[PDB]
Amino acid sequence: GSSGSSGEAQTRVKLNFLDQIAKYWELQGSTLKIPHVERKILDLFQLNKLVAEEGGFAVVCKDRKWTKIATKMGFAPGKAVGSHIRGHYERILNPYNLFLSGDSLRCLQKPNLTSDTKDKEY
């Protein structure tokens, strides 16, 4: 009969995720704190969420569809924020996903220190 209700979660829906990802850290003994993107807190939860909605990490990366997300987060359509999205994940959502996946193999590729050699003559 009477159909017309509304009141989905807003602040909680976000806290939920953070809480979970936080428990993973609180265990080791580290404090979870989100950075400030363009003078605006970057809500990881949503961030990643939007990405999947637009297509996914793979697809998005292929078509570099990062501008859409970042921009949708209130950020300006540039480049800096573009790479930021990825990093934020590899900086915070690095381990969380490293375990969620299961495949121990999946790990952050470490670089190869650069060496230098000098030679003189008489």
Swiss-Prot record:
Kindly provide the name given to this protein in its UniProt entry.
Lysine-specific demethylase 5B
The shown chain, on whole-protein numbering, covers 94 to 208 of 1544
Provide the ARID domain boundaries: 11-101
Glycyl lysine isopeptide (Lys-Gly) (interchain with G-Cter in SUMO2): where is this cross-link?
Answer: K62, K118
Domain notes per entry: Both the JmjC domain and the JmjN domain are required for enzymatic activity. However ARID and PHD-type 1 domain are not required for activity per se but contributed to recognition of the H3(1-21)K4me2 substrate peptide. The 2 first PHD-type zinc finger domains are required for transcription repression activity.
Q: Which tissues carry this protein?
A: Present at highest levels in testis, where it is enriched in spermatogonia and pachytene cells (at protein level).
What does gene deletion cause?
Answer: Homozygous KDM5B-null mice are subviable, exhibit vertebral patterning defects, and manifest numerous behavioral abnormalities including increased anxiety, less sociability, and reduced long-term memory compared with that of wild-types. Heterozygous mice appear normal.
Indicate the secretion signal residues.
none
